[PDB]
RNA sequence: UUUAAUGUUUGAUGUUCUAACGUUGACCCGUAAUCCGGGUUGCGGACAGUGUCUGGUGGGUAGUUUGACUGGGGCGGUCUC
RNA sequence: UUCCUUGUCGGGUAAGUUCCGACCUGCACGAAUGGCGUAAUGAUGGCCAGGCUGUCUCCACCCGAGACUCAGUGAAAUUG
RNA sequence: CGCCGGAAGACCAAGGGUUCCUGUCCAACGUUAAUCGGGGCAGGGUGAGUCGACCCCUAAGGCGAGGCCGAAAGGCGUAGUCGAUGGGAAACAGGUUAAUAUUCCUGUACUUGGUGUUACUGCGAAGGGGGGACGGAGAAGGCUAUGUUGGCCGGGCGACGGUUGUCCCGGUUUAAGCGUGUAGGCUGGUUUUCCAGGCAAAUCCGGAAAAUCAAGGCUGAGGCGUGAUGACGAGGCACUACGGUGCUGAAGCAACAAAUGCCCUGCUUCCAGGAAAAGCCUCUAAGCAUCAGGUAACAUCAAAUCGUACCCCAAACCGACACAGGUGGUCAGGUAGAGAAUACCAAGGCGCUUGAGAGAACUCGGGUGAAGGAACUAGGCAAAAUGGUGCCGUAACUUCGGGAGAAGGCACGCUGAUAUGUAGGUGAGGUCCCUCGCGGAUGGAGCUGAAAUCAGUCGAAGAUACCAGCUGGCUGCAACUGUUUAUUAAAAACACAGCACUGUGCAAACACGAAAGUGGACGUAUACGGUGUGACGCCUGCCCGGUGCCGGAAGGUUAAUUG
RNA sequence: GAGGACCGAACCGACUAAUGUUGAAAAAUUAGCGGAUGACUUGUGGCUGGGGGUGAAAGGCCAAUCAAACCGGGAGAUAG
């Protein structure tokens, strides 16, 4: 749960710093 | 791969059995709560 | 003798071993053995109370005679043996009445030599007397601190004590640390130094050689995180603080002795 | 005003002592027991150690604080008359 | 570890911001939070050559498993 | 027909618990249908003196009368008492059910107790001594399981050329026990006299002295004999309710090869120096002494209770699933091979619970490719290549070991001869000795059998398949083998041997605990703790002003207390 | 006949790439890769408990949960 591993993977998720 | 539950009835009883609950003051608190609630199986015994 | 191994492997290049051809090649004397289980540095609470201890080889305790209270009966050294529990070597001695015991082997002692204990014993290495019968200046070992209690000083390989002075009921000894101390003159001591004096010339050579002796690896405090040691933290290698033990007390210089009841026996602390 | 001699503490210091207290010294008994207790003796001894009070030290541990305005915030400047 | 900076000079390439050798103008190395070397070792970092090749010029054909049609069973995210 | 065969076969422990076997049913369950099923329903099935548990004995550890300690609850711990993953008596072969079998049946065995009779007699423990009783590696020697070939026995004479022979197919098995005592291994034997030792005693163990003897003893695989004129046995015959059931039954030998099993808890060596207690043997104490008790033979009785089906690399256990995952031990055939690798097979077991077509793009997994050959790309990523045995040959540098399998190169099939099968291994009959035996010497039948050389011969290719290093040059970092972010980081990070500083004199410092206590350590400064650095080589310069630590104590300031 | 020696299966690991990403699988498969007599690996049992343990040190691990586990309570915490 929470995943959807691509909603945890932070290259995919944290794309705009 | 290896999971977390590896059964063994010796350690199941030496940890959670009736005679292990009765051996300490807090173990006898657990048994008193399960009797008050009304549980059919008090402990993991047989 | 010390011998250097040849470098036929990276783990043999730096090994130096001490080989004594005159130790016993056989099983030890069974009646004087006991069981010695390890601890891992854990007390009766199950907690680690000394770090870097754990593993090693199985060992059997040899009941060594530190009191030497079999007075007046001569003994003959039967053999020299290996003891895993101490750095020195033990000897097996046979008394004229048929009793066998283990004693710490002094320097120069070999199979066939005669030893004796008591007030009438001769002044030769291996003999045990009260220290009021030992001439001043002598080099003694296996010294008692309280009469009749058994030897506690100068028990490690190559160590000894010097009787510096005698005054009434006390003698002044110079301990191996270079520290003067007064003991009662009715305490016993064995004449001579402890053997195996080349024990310090050995080189373990590899990291597994110290795991054979029951010593687990040490992690530097400066390589931890701040929650673990007071030295931890930082990007790159940072120290910027005074060295301390993992429980916060200052090391490198601070003095920890506080014993006011045995301070009367210290003539002079070491330097 | 100074001084001593006098008897006393009462303090301070020092040296002896033993009887409190310590003993993870030896021996004996309960006892079939390296716990404990009692006994005999040795060594220390009014010290050590513990309670109450007290000065110091104390990120070892804990609870918290670390302003606003602002052509985004920080940096700088300002904040009342 | 050097910002200026692809410093300059030499080597290697037809051509080399990387690599190797030097120089010293060290923004901002340096001596047990060690300095400088070092044989052997490393699923360690950089660079060069030989062999080898569908990596590529630049793709073509073939062999199987799906994709497609028939019968049977039969989901899911999502949705004013 | 295909697949596994160091398993995808067989047997267990753990775990599960009726999934086991028979009859019947097909609603739901089964990724489809189902007449089938580990599904529904009903019935049946688990047989022990010897296997396991229970039992006797202990390890780590637990609990713990008194005790010590703590506001209470409680903590620790002595005597004790539990606790196996370890020590302790005893059974094998064949037969049989649909389903159990070392449990039932047939044959042949063995163990420990009680009771009784007879004979002789010093018995007796909570105590003493022995024993149990113990590491890593290495090297063999002697064997066996097992396999292969030959002989023997039974059958065969071949769908298509040939096949009465140097031919083909199948079998050639037998245990525990009991008797003997061998290859090997260890040890000197016997008797007497004395003794500060073994908490007391001792005739036992330990020690001392003398005489005498050159042998004795302990242990020990295998073989042989018996067990066994038995059982089993290829087939044949007779029935079949077609699955099976009944009867009879030949030969049942030798040579060679050979274990990772056994002798072997041995032997040799090394350092890191390698459980405990009981069962067992023995010695006495108090005690008892026409007894009791002990030894032996015989007879008799007893050996209770619980497990036992079935699955166990799995559709039955752990993963929500009939889930490409995980799961300890035992067994271990053939042909090639060094091999438990790899290829093809045996015993045995399976084809993985949707199929049928077609033969588009694209995706996945593979094969081949003209000329070129890294031009691709962040980067030779990925692929291709190399790859075996024997011999020749091999640089810088080096800590003298290495580097190094450096690099590179040559030979390799089959047939014949040397030699009707050699060198080597094994070793019968026979002859002689004596020790008349599980012996020694000689001898060489038979069996097995590399490597090489010469000569010939086939292909494009002889390490033919599977299997099986790419290599070299310069350089940074870390000496090295290790460890690490289970599940995006394996590294230059952590560790490390070595080095230094520092604390610690033993009721040690130090750590866990209101404490008692415990670890450090049954250790003692050549030891122990902390800190930093990190093999080895050459080395490690100046600053004590700041912060810290160590020493000092004169003077200044300074708490409770006093008043 | 030594060795934290060498090559290499079982065994223990996890260096690369492709597949998969509502998977066959809440971390695997395929092909290669490392160690493989040791600071090894594994079975059965035991001990350490939450500001605590353990850690060849990564804030790693403590039942698919970790810069402070899980369960119940204070508790209907508080929320400009
Ligand atoms: N994507 C992979 C790996 C993965 C598992 N859990 C993840 C969480 C986050 C990122 C990746 C993963 C998978 O699904 O198997
Ligand atoms: K014993
Ligand atoms: K360290
Ligand atoms: K750091
Ligand atoms: K006293
Ligand atoms: K005091
Ligand atoms: K703006
Ligand atoms: K504004
Ligand atoms: K710099
Ligand atoms: K150039
Ligand atoms: K040029
Ligand atoms: K270096
Ligand atoms: K590496
Ligand atoms: K390199
Ligand atoms: K059906
Ligand atoms: K299903
Ligand atoms: K057992
Ligand atoms: K006895
Ligand atoms: K004797
Ligand atoms: K059964
Ligand atoms: K190779
Ligand atoms: K690695
Ligand atoms: K690390
Ligand atoms: K030290
Ligand atoms: K101890
Ligand atoms: K200074
Ligand atoms: K200073
Ligand atoms: K100063
Ligand atoms: K070897
Ligand atoms: K183990
Ligand atoms: K917590
Ligand atoms: Mg340490
Ligand atoms: Mg160290
Ligand atoms: Mg870190
Ligand atoms: Mg801190
Ligand atoms: Mg820095
Ligand atoms: Mg704070
Ligand atoms: Mg503060
Ligand atoms: Mg608050
Ligand atoms: Mg603001
Ligand atoms: Mg602004
Ligand atoms: Mg240039
Ligand atoms: Mg350069
Ligand atoms: Mg630096
Ligand atoms: Mg600096
Ligand atoms: Mg310096
Ligand atoms: Mg420095
Ligand atoms: Mg350097
Ligand atoms: Mg379709
Ligand atoms: Mg359809
Ligand atoms: Mg929605
Ligand atoms: Mg096959
Ligand atoms: Mg059922
Ligand atoms: Mg069935
Ligand atoms: Mg159906
Ligand atoms: Mg079935
Ligand atoms: Mg059924
Ligand atoms: Mg207790
Ligand atoms: Mg018991
Ligand atoms: Mg069956
Ligand atoms: Mg005994
Ligand atoms: Mg015939
Ligand atoms: Mg015939
Ligand atoms: Mg014909
Ligand atoms: Mg035949
Ligand atoms: Mg006992
Ligand atoms: Mg299951
Ligand atoms: Mg569930
Ligand atoms: Mg299936
Ligand atoms: Mg499965
Ligand atoms: Mg396995
Ligand atoms: Mg195979
Ligand atoms: Mg078959
Ligand atoms: Mg196709
Ligand atoms: Mg081409
Ligand atoms: Mg062609
Ligand atoms: Mg070509
Ligand atoms: Mg290019
Ligand atoms: Mg390009
Ligand atoms: Mg590659
Ligand atoms: Mg060269
Ligand atoms: Mg050489
Ligand atoms: Mg050379
Ligand atoms: Mg070569
Ligand atoms: Mg560089
Ligand atoms: Mg390294
Ligand atoms: Mg490594
Ligand atoms: Mg990771
Ligand atoms: Mg990755
Ligand atoms: Mg990784
Ligand atoms: Mg230390
Ligand atoms: Mg370092
Ligand atoms: Mg000071
Ligand atoms: Mg190795
Ligand atoms: Mg491997
Ligand atoms: Mg790992
Ligand atoms: Mg991988
Ligand atoms: Mg793999
Ligand atoms: Mg390799
Ligand atoms: Mg290997
Ligand atoms: Mg080891
Ligand atoms: Mg961090
Ligand atoms: Mg959870
Ligand atoms: Mg977890
Ligand atoms: Mg918190
Ligand atoms: Mg409230
Ligand atoms: Mg609320």
Author numbering:
A (entry chain B5): 8 to 24
B (entry chain B2): 1 to 46
C (entry chain BC): 2 to 272
Mind quoting what the paper says about this structure?
Free L-tryptophan (L-Trp) stalls ribosomes engaged in the synthesis of TnaC, a leader peptide controlling the expression of the Escherichia coli tryptophanase operon. Our structural data reveal how the ribosome and nascent TnaC co-operate to capture a single molecule of L-Trp and explain the role of various functionally important residues, such as the strictly conserved Trp12 and Asp16 of TnaC, the 23S rRNA base pair A752:U2609 and residue Lys90 of uL22.
In contrast, the Q252A mutation in the GGQ loop that reduces the RF2-dependent rate of hydrolysis of peptidyl-tRNA without interfering with the recognition of the stop codon33 had no effect on the interaction between RF2 and the stalled complex.
